[PDB]
């Protein structure tokens with residue numbers, strides 16, 4: 083029969099033919115591989131678009147909207163350097179891994195201003211404009227949630243959003259500049275080279291642009307989440323510490339270099355297409371532009387350098403001299419603090435915990451300092467852009483992944499609620515007529531009985547243990563639908579993990595097996611009081627002000643996340659789903675299964691499932707008229723897309739169940755657009771005959787349209803007189 | 807207010823304003839169609855009329871808002887004068903009959919695309935008494951169909 087899409091282990095889907103049908107699974111022959119057969123579940127074989135060469139800007143224009151046809155549409159577009167595609171209001175953005183021309187220019191920015199979604203090609207600029215327009219018209223704060231794996235393109239698209247908004251609707255001066263320079267400055271202190279991203283954000287952010295009642299920019303505000311503390315001291319083989327460290331070492335003047343006792347990064351225990359020298363220059367530029375004087379800039383530099391030398395003390399004399407000097411401490415006070423009777427391992431961890439605490443508090447200071455550069459007393463609305471990593475494959479899932487996957491559960495719920503709301507409003511407006519993950523959220527975060535609280539309890543015990551904590555989780559949530567023991571896994575390596583050494587959580591994106599070693603220690607952000615007192619009595623004013631025994635990481639983040647959701651829930655929301663095409667940072671390399679998996683994990687396939695419940699195919703009268711006028715008589719091709727479509731509906735006699743003539747679009751039940759396309763592609767003469775028998779009605783419709791239009795103009799004329 | 811059928815007719819007439827369709831119109835489209843049918847409102851008059859229903863403040867108008875904008879208190883005698891006035895928009899020389907050439911003028915002013923043969927067909931279908939022209943009675947009958 084007709085070719086169909088069927089699973090492919092590396093392409094996600096492949097073309098094949100159904101050669102046999104079973105009650106559970108179908109037999110598929112891959113295209114041209116006669117003799118080769120394989121089995122697929124019925125629910126994993128999908129109809130394909132007859133035209134395999136076309137692409138559509140909005141996936142709702144496909145005759146068959148499923149995960150396979152969507153994968154293919156996005157694939158075609160990507161191969162033509164069209165990285166952006168809609169699923170109704172949702173933007174899918176595939177990372178190109180190269181600089182595509184024209185599409186980010188200031189002149190392109192201008193072409194997007196004031197345009198409705200779908201009047202211009204899909205773009206991050208269009209999502210940004212709709213958010214400004216909705217804020218102004220609806221008088222409602224707005225959020226743009228940009229999601230995806232590390233290296234998917236979240237930070238870049240966030241920066242495109244902020245470029246667009248300031249250029250289009252900014253003040254003209256000096257606050258616009260500070261909005262676009264804020265993040266690159268934060269990236270110095272919060273970004274790092276990882277194995278997934280050369281410029282990975284090791285923190286989450288919500289960046290708000292605030293407006294007055296006249297929807298004019300009055301300020302900005304940045305919230306930050308979960309700075310990766312462990313990277314400060316140790317990093318993986320093919321990874322780096324935060325950019326600042328290398329930028330300072332590379333680009334500082336000889337004067338600063340002597341003051342801070344700096345060398346090449348290879349002289350520091352804590353430490354290419356990476357231009358550290360150039361980036362330092364750009365950083366100083368940003369710093370001056372946002373209003374940092376050289377004193378503050380150097381106060382920042384000294385602390386950074388102080389942390390570097392601190393890491394050079396192993397259990398050194400010169401490093402101790404430099405560190406105590408820069409951090410404003412007495413050498414002896416510091417030496418004692420790192421050794422009071424301690425073993426070598428305990429001494430390393432004291433030095434490391436101080437370095438982490440100092441740096442993290444510096445990052446808090448830098449984020450606050452940035453907010454101090456575009457402050458506001460009051461505002462009416464904001465447009466906020468959320469840039470945080472979601473679920474992603476790790477071979478070992480520890481506490482960091484636990485926190486990020488918990489965040490994803492809460493944000494995915496918001497997305498689910500919002501996408502449902504958007505669809506309901508459409509069906510009601512046009513006259514067309516779920517499974518929460520709250521239980522998984524509750525497992526993690528509920529007071530007293532949730533994992534976060536159980537973890538905190540362990541931290542407070544006289545002898546905390548990862549194993550005691552893990553067992554407490556398993557006993558409390560033995561029968562929870564979302565919780566499982568590793569030895570139940572289908573994968574051998576999970577089964578190697580003892581009951582008290584991990585657990586499985588059935589997250590939105592799929593089961594995750596957590597190894598719980600180090601959960602207790604990772605949940606604690608506190609610094610020992612012997613170390614905190616030391617740094618609090620620094621001869622230096624700046625080091626004292628950074629700071630002016632247990633602190634829960636998980637519950638601190640829960641508080642932050644709940645505040646974020648309060649904000650998000652008060653906004654109208656738009657969603658950009660970013661997609662990493664491969665694991666190699668290379669352009670023109672579309673890895674179908676990797677991309678398919680992202681589409682599944684981020685909830686897009688679920689969104690498609692929802693739309694198959696109603697009218698998944700949606701086409702404007704203009705789009706249809708352009709597609710099908712060539713099949714009709716010249717007389718009909720001379721209308722007027724609305725009347726053209728009206729005449730088709732009348733001539734074909736399309737039923738009210740399958741076809742909805744909307745306010746501006748035709749809405750089709752599943753399979754019905756394909757049936758309509760089929761009707762249009764037969765049988766020229768019979769089609770002509772169907773139009774013929776509708777002729778009188780069509781002439782009358784034409785008459786009345788113009789007759790009732792002139793009556794409208796008379797009433798409008800008379801109204802203007804009534805008002806005068 | 808209006809009957810279900812009147813609303814249906816005005817919705818089709820609204821597509822002539824809302825050409826990109828779309829579903830909404832501004833002051834720009836208001837004036838063009840108005841000028842296309844021999845009316846000449848100023849921009850302040852358009853702006854002021856828009857103000858009633860642009861509630862809003864965005865300078866755009868949807869179909870229910872358009873119907874409200876056309877609404878006003880009317881005498882017993884008013885709606886008949888308006889229909890007579892609509893006929894005169896077509897009957898440009900005031901001889902009581904709409905000719906093929908007069909319909910073409912109106913059609914083409916409104917951006918309608920059809921051949922002269924199709925303009926003649928329109929006249930023929932409305933032309934009940936068969937004299938090749940559309941008088942007031944036939945005009946009304948067609949408008950009421």
Ligand SMILES: Nc1ncnc2c1ncn2[C@@H]1O[C@H](COP(=O)(O)OP(=O)(O)O)[C@@H](O)[C@H]1O
Nearest residue numbers: 177179180181231232233234235236237238281
């Ligand atoms: N639209 C784009 N155009 C050009 N390059 C891009 C684009 N999106 C991503 N990149 C490249 O990919 C890298 C990773 O993108 P980034 O936005 O940092 O990912 P994420 O924030 O999702 O971890 C960037 O540093 C940049 O080199």
Ligand code: BEF
Nearest residue numbers: 232233279282283
């Ligand atoms: F590496 Be990214 F900023 F998720």
Ligand SMILES: [Ca+2]
Nearest residue numbers: 824827828830
């Ligand atoms: Ca319009």
Ligand SMILES: [Ca+2]
Nearest residue numbers: 860862866867
């Ligand atoms: Ca309005």
Ligand SMILES: [Ca+2]
Nearest residue numbers: 897899901903
């Ligand atoms: Ca005449």
Ligand SMILES: [Ca+2]
Nearest residue numbers: 933937939940
């Ligand atoms: Ca006649």
Ligand SMILES: [Mg+2]
Nearest residue numbers: 236237282283
């Ligand atoms: Mg990022």
